[PDB]
Structure formats: structure tokens, C-alpha cells
Amino acid sequence: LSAEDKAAVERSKMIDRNLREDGEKAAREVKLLLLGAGESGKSTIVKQMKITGIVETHFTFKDLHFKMFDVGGQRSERKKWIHCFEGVTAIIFCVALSDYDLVNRMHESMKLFDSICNNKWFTDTSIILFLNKKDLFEEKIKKSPLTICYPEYAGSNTYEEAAAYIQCQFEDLNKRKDTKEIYTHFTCATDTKNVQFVFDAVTDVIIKNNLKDCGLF
Amino acid sequence: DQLRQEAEQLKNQIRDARKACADATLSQITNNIDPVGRIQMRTRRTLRGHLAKIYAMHWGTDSRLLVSASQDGKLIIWDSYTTNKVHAIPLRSSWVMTCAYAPSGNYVACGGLDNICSIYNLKTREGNVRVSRELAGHTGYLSCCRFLDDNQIVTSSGDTTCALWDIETGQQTTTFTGHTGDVMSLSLAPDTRLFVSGACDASAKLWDVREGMCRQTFTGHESDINAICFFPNGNAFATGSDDATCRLFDLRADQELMTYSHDNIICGITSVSFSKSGRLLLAGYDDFNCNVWDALKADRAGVLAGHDNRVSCLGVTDDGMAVATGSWDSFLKIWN
Amino acid sequence: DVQLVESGGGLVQPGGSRKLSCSASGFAFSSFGMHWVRQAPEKGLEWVAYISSGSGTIYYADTVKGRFTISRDDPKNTLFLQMTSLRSEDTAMYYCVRSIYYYGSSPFDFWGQGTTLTVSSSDIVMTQATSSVPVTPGESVSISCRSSKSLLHSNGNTYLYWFLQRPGQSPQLLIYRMSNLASGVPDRFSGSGSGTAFTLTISRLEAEDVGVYYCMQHLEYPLTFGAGTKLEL
Amino acid sequence: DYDEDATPCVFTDVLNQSKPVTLFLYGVVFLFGSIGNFLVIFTITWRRRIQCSGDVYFINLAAADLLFVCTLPLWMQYLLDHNSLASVPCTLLTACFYVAMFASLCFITEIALDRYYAIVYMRYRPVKQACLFSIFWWIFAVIIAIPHFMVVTKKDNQCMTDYDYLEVSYPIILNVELMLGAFVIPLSVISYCYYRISRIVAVSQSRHKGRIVRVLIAVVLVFIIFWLPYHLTLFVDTLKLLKWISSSCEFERSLKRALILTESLAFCHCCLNPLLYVFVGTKFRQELHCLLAE
């Protein structure tokens, strides 16, 4: 029956206890993918969190542990490793607003958003959209008009209407509105107003996960 | 310049030479041998214990222990006979896309999006498992770490390169460049003298270990290649792709031998591994079920539908006792 | 730098109580099943007790089942044997022994220094074929060991361990499961045998290799050792 | 002459008409509840998927219902005829019966508390503490059941409670705990917790909020429809035993018949709950679908 296999099975049971305890510990931990364009405010977002290859930043907020994965360090084909993030709590997307100089970065950001928002994995994972650098964006728009990038923008050359146009133009790219909602927030340089928004937009997905796992539906 | 025209003419010459050495397809040759029949293999064991999607597995050379890595941050070394967990090594970074178990059994390597193949020393003193060596130097993402010996390891990454690391020094000996897309798989020849790497440019290249330069390049897939495995004779290898077909090539004739497409399957292949004799080609698919092909007649000779998620890793033992398929539902079925 | 060092022991009146404690400096203590094994002043080894990892399974020898209790403090890496009602036959040197049980492991790998303890005033019988064998350096000698019950379990491997104890030194594991050499022993030793009859064979002897060789069974508790075959140079 | 008001209120026709209905509902509860709780056990225990506190409480409630429907056939044989000649050891059987009933209601309460703490507060319970709370609730279930089985002493054929040797209001002090302990506290707790989390899921953005509220109201509705007549009959029984309504004769026979029928209905609830609790979600339904292929 068992001679040392009793002790081997006991070791396996202790290993099972450690695996289940670590699964409980890491199943209540919020996972935030962090995507965006090159030389954008992603590093500024990571800096504003009060703490090659993939980078993980851990931080506690409202007694909730957030792992935030800045993965844009590696440059390869995203389709072969994005399924590793099927099951992140939220996708913090980042968009620099004041960039139109590389050979048109805002169109590249829109292509990245369109490619990442309609994955077969990310149907239910909500996207927290950040629009960085409001001051430099306002200086740029008062210096150069929006017609260089979007000719069909019809309205005032002011901050509010152009910002709303960019925000809606990002939001309407999603083809599954009922499954997830784009929580667009204007990051700027504002201190302690970003993490609270992340917590607010993540508690709804946490409640949905609780509803799914508790067996109500 | 005209060098692109010269390269096109040279590729045309290669194709013409290949069609000059082709006389009859493998289906024509083996149209007279009897089929293997339906291969009914049941789930003998079920290695439960991972908390996330399993992305890799490599059997031991003793055909009993198997190490499997998952995104819960851990890779587990299982005693597959008794379904135990010999070891549960927690990763430094939870993102892992590959794992290997050394032929001697002392070492276990694994790599992922951290761009480091971490090599753990199992049969050491002090009872626990410690990083023997963290090999860094890739700039993409490692998709396959594979062991040659206890001291050499070939790793294929997402920077379009393979590499041959000397473990005790840590510096890669030879870098295998020549791919244009991310190299998603790697498979050693039984004599560990050559190997084949399948990349996302729909090409499998036969690299020479001792020299450091590619010898042969095989094309014929329309889409990305996610798996590759040598035929046990060492003079052929299958190639699993996203074109929902495996393609059995060969090294000596340097051509395509057989295609394993089927109308009922439309999504790709995540893992391929031959049987011990090589007659049966087991291919793990992403339509939640494995398929067992009669590799000399292209007849779908079995279906393994025990998983309810994508079968990401497949492995046949060296003695051919069993075939274990681990999937994204955290389960490692062991069919036989 | 694996180091098990015992503390406690010494002189004690009969019927009293005394606590032994071995500190385990240099390894991952919490993963290791531990044993207490005692050796009488001029006799062979005797197994006393065993704790698993995490104290989930504890076994005692039937002789001392009840008079001794055993415990482990994993955070301070210490193993305690609290001895109560020390009768006359407990005067012995005690070793706390490391042992990890997985597939292909080598239990009873390391043996502590051991402390003496002097007082005042179906078990598988493993028997050595003799108690002393004449020997010269450079000669291959075979040491036999007899078992009451067939140690060949149904799963294939026979649980029998060969230990060597140098004069004035703690015993070291030589062979585990009759065929596998321990990590750190030379390739001279080779074990063979059927389920009942077992044989160690040493070729190309050296000067420091002489000592007392014990054969232990590990099929079922209690783990009865052998009488001990000694080699004299 | 004689004494006119000492004519007993007979119960022959009550028992004769009660036997077929009671035996039928007992058999229905036995087979439906046995398969419905064995499905939960095989769906959770074999896959070893006890990862959240919800799994622990589902396992405990299914085990309580399983023990209930396993003590049920002994009562069925105890009722059939007099062939059950001392083969039914009253005290332990009643003990397990009442412990199972009160444990099922206690774990319904614990499921509601766990859902309430996980949703409106996000204060989850680890399985290491879920086992502690499970043994605490089982201990409490035995503690709330001792004034029900500490008196049931067997006799030649059937079970006894010597109310003459007991206090004046022992049936009062037993059935008032049977209503308040087993119907007022659990219904109040599940109603408050489920209304709070329904208010939460009304504001939250979900694609199945209507279905969630439907299931949440449906479980409480099933509880009410299956237990409320039983505790109304217990309430008017308490009125009678406190000499408060008319002390009639045929009223007692009708009350006894209704009491047996409503007891059977409560047993039907203890039969019917596991599919409403466990198999109402797509998770455990899909888990069952991949397990039935053995």
C-alpha cells in the first residue's frame, strides 16, 4: 500500500496546502495590465504610484493589493503573449495627448486601442483609459490646431471640446459596449486623484467577479 | 540593389532543386500499408494543483517525473505514477511560457516574459530548490528553454533569436540569428547535434549546435508556427501552426512530406509531439481537444477531449508509456 | 554547511526527566521529516521516534511509546525530545537524523553529532550475518544482511539503507534503497540482493573506511537497525 | 350518570389519511434530495475545488441535507407499521434529524452572511477560517438541538417525551425555539443580507443584474412558501398549548393534519435547496457537465 509513500503523500498534501493558500492570497490581488504608446506618460503613471522584459509594481491602496504590469518594455508580436493576461482585473490604457510628431502617434495609439480592445480574451476585462499631459496638450492645441491629425474635427480650437472629441473618439472604437466600459480619466499631474479613480473603477469588476464566483448567476 | 533579384533567383533555384528531387509523396508511398486503427486512450491520471493556465511541461528521461509551469507563479514537479507533487518551485516572476526538465534530472529551467531562463537545482543539499543560474540576455520573450546537458541550454526567444547558454559561466556561447519573426518553439534532435526552431514567420530552421549557423530552412506554412518536434529517427520533424494543420517535413530530402489539415478543425495547434516509434503524431489543439494522427496516412486516428480549455502543452515520454496533455484549465491529463 | 548539533543529556537520575534539543543550522528545516535514533554505549543503533514535516504524523518505537514525547520548533529550527521516566536502559548517545521523503530522495542523509545520556542505578528483525570481519586495505569485502520479511514492496523498490559509522563519528548514509549511493560517498560501494537477502560490497578499500556498518529497514515502522558489522584494519 | 366533557379527541382518521401522503412525500424527499446532494458532493469533492468559503459552506449545507435524508428512511420505517420493533434507536435518530435541520438553516444563514461580507464590504473569509466557522456552526447546531433530543426516550414500539415529568411549558419552550431560532433568525438574516447585496447589484453595472435579483428573490420566496405554513401551524399550536384559542376538539385534529403536511413541506424544502443554491450558477453547472462523463 504505502511504506514511504505515506510520507510522500503527506509532503504532497502539505504542498497542496501551500498552493491553495497562495492561490487564496493571489486571487484577491488586483491585476492591472498597463498598455500604451512609446515615450508616453506610462512611466509618469508608474512614478505617481506611491510604492528588461515585463515590469511589476506592487502597491497597497485602501487595504487592497495591486500588481500593475508594465509590459511595454519588450518589443515583439503582442498576439503571442497577450493571452497570458486573459484574466487581469483591469487594463490601464495610457494615451499621451500632446504628441503628433513621429512619422501621427495619436493614430498609432488608436490602432493599439482598437487592437487591444477587441481581443477574444479582453471581452470582459474593463479598460481604464488615461489621457496624460493636459497642460502640454493645451499649449500644443493653442499653438497648433487639431486639423493636422484629424481634419474632420468641426468645432472650437479650445481645450474642452477637443478633449471631449478625443475621449469619445477613443470610446467609440469598442464593439462590445455592454460587456465592458471605458473609464476614461484625465490624469494630468494630479496627485492622489488617480489611484482613488483606479480603485473606484476596479471595485465594480471585483464585485462582478464576486457575483460570478459566489454562484448567484 | 540587384541582390534581392539574386536572392529571388536563388530561392527559385532551391525550389526547382526540391522539385527535381521529388518523385512520390509519402501518401503515395504508404498508400499500401494497413492503418493503425482507432487509438482509444483513456485518462489514467489527472495532475491537479495549479491555480492558473498551464503553459508548458517536459517529461523526465526516467519517464516518471514531469515539471509543469503555470501562470499562478509556480512550476510543479509531479510524480506522475502516484499523482504526487515532488516539488513546487515558486517563480520570481509569475509570467512563464516554457519549462524543461534536464535529462539527468538535477536541473529544471523555465522562462517567460521576464526575458530570463531561470535554472533551478533540484537534487542539491538543504532540501529546497534554489536558482542555480538566471540566464539573461534576450530582448523578446522566451518561448522554449531546452536542456542539452547539465551545463548547456538552448533557449528560443521573441527577439527572433535562439541561443546556446553555458550555464556555469552564464554567457551564451552561440547566438542563432536568422529568423524574422518571434521563435515560438524549439526541439532537440535525439543525438543533441542539431535542432529545429519554428518561428512566427511560417518557417522552421535547422540550426547546428556545434557550429552556430543554420543549415536548412523549411517553409510551407501560411501562418504562425507554435510547435515543433523531431521524429524519433532524427531525420524528420513535425510542425504545428496556426493554419490548423501540422506539417511533417524531413531533413535529408529537405522538403515537405505530409500535411495534416482537416475540414472540421479551423483553429491552430499549440503543441506537437511524436510517439516513441513515431507512427503516431499527437498534436495539441486550441479547440480544447488533442488529435492523434496516423503520421504515415494522415488519418485522424484519435481524439482526446478531456479538457474544457485550450491544450497548451503536450508531452510523450521517452519510453512511450503515456502522453500527458496540460491545458489552460489547470489540468494535466495523462492519456494512455 | 549542513549542521545538526544536539544539546542536553548528561547525568540524570533514573525515573527523572530530561529534554534534548538539536539545533538545525544550515538547511531548510521545515521541509524535513526528522528522526531521533539512539545508540547504546556498546550496542547497535535503535530507532526512537520520527516527526513528519509540519508535525502531521508522529511515530514512536514500541519500547518507548509513551514515555518520550517529540516536537519541533520550525521558526527557530530546533527539534525537541522531552524524555520522561528515564529507566536504566535509556543511557545512550542520541542523534537527530534528517530525512526527506519524495520520489528519488535520500532519507537519513545526515546525522547529528549526538549527545550522551547517562542514567544511574511485528517488528522486522534485521540481523547482520556476523559482528566482525577481518579485512586488509585494497581488498573487496561483502557484508550480508538478513530480513524477517520481504522488503520488496509492490511498487518495486526495496526499502533498505546501509549506514557506516566511523570510530568516534556519527553514522553517515552510504546506500539508500539497496542500490542508490548517497550524495558524497565514493563509487566503491554497491548493494544487491533479493527481497530478503541483502549484500553490500566494497571494492578497493582505504584506511579511513573501516567502521561499523548497519543495515536498516524502512518498509514499516519501527525501523529496526542491524546488529552492526565491524571492520578492523 | 357520567362526565360529559371528558370525551377524548380521537386521531384515527387523521393518522390513516396522513400515512399515504406522508410516506409519499418522505420517499420523494429521500430520492430527490439524495441525488441532488450527491451531485453537489461529486461536483465539489472529486475535483477538490474547495477554493473559496462559498465552496466550504455549500459542502457543509449539502452534508447537512445528506445526513437529514439519510436519517429520513429510518423515520419512514418507524412510521410504516409496528414491524420496527426496537430497530430504531429514538434518541440518536432524533438528534441527527434535528441537528441536520438546524444545521441546514444555520448554513443557509452562513451562506447569506458570506455573500453579504464578500459583496457589500469585500471582507472575504479564507478556507482556513471557513473550516473553523463550519465547525462552530455545527457546534451551534448541536447546541440549539439539545432541548429537542435530550428528552426523547425510547419505549416498547415508539418514542416518548414525558411532558408530565417535564415542566409545565416545555412544549412551549421547545417549539418557540423551533420557530424563532429556525425561522425568525434565518429568514431575517437572509432577507437583510440579500436585500443589501441586491441594492448593491442594482447600482453595479452587470449584464445579469436582473437575473441575479430574480434568483435572489426566488431563494427567499422558496424559503417563505415552504416554511411559512409550518411556522404558522407551530404558532397556532403554541396558542393552543398556552390555552389561548378555544381549546376545541376537531380543531385539534385539523391542526394536527395540517402540522404533519407542513412538516413534510419543510422536509421538501430541505430536499429542494441544493439546486437552488449551487446549481443555479453557470459555474457549477458547467462543472457538473464536465464531470458527468465519468
Added chain:
Amino acid sequence: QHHGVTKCNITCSKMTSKIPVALLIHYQQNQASCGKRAIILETRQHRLFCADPKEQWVKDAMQHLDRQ
């Protein structure tokens, strides 16, 4: 014990004071499941009456059921 399996086919609320033994015909203890001990009696009118089970006339009934 739940109310579904109680077997007191005869149940009493008030105990009789004194019945002459001549009118009484048969006496038999109630179905023992509800605790309060009583003896149900069939009389010459063939209707049912309670009696406290300590009344000696049952013994006299036991006499004249079988002495005759």
C-alpha cells in the same frame, strides 16, 4: 420528535372524576407516544372516556372481563 410521527391516536384534556365499574366494559392504556399517561375506556354506551391510569377499577374490569 417532529410532529409527523407522533402516534397518540387517543388524546385527553380532562380526567374523569368517578365512573361506576358496572357501567364500564373495557379499559386499555392510550397509545404511548405523547407522555401524559391515561387509560381510554369503552363503556356500555360504546363511547369513549378518559380515566387516570391509577384508578383501581381497571383491575376490577380485568376481573369481570374474564371471570364471566
Added chain:
Amino acid sequence: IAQARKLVEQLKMEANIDRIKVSKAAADLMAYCEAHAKEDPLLTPVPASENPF
């Protein structure tokens, strides 16, 4: 650039390889699969006497 020269030299090295008739490789693979069918448990199911699963 240098990539064109590297690729054309690689194709020159790949072209100058003695390729055999594909019928010969097919026959070799068929012979290998016929000469190892007795040692393949997956193809021919072995009984429970030797099967460790």
C-alpha cells in the same frame, strides 16, 4: 545593406546540400515506423501487467 549579403550567403549555403529523392526518405520513415511498432505502447495498447498507469 549587410542583411542582403547575409541572406544571399545563407541561401547559397542552404542550396548546396546533397538532397536525396523524397521516396528514399519516405521509405526510411516507413521502415522506422514498421521496425518500432513492437516497442510503442501508444499504438498497440499494452496490458495492465506492464503498464504503470
